[PDB]
Amino acid sequence: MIKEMIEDFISKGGLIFTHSGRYTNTNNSCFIFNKNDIGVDTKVDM
DNA sequence: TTAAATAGGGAAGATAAGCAAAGGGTTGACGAAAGCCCTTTGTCCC
Numbered sequence A: 001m002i003k004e005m006i007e008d009f010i011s012k013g014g015l016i017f018t019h020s021g022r023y024t025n026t027n028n029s030c031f032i033f034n035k036n037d038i039g040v041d042t043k044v045d046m
Numbered sequence B: 001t002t003a004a005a006t007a008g009g010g011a012a013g014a015t016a017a018g019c020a021a022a023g024g025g026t027t028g029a030c031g032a033a034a035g036c037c038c039t040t041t042g043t044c045c046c
Helices: A003-012
Strands: none
Touching: none
């Protein structure tokens, strides 16, 4: 129920991130992940 | 071209009825990340 979608994501050039600069300009491709900000109700983006 | 001295107490402010219907509220322009092909320029090999 969850794994197949994980192979779906890793098949393409997907990335998991919490902070990015693409929200200021669409042409940006900067993605970084922060481990210290992970909590119970922390929303992430991909 | 005046010195002082005060300016009311009481009562009381109406009720009933009703405020409409119909029609319409616009279009056109503001994408990134690739795949393939061709051409040109430049480098290297044969």
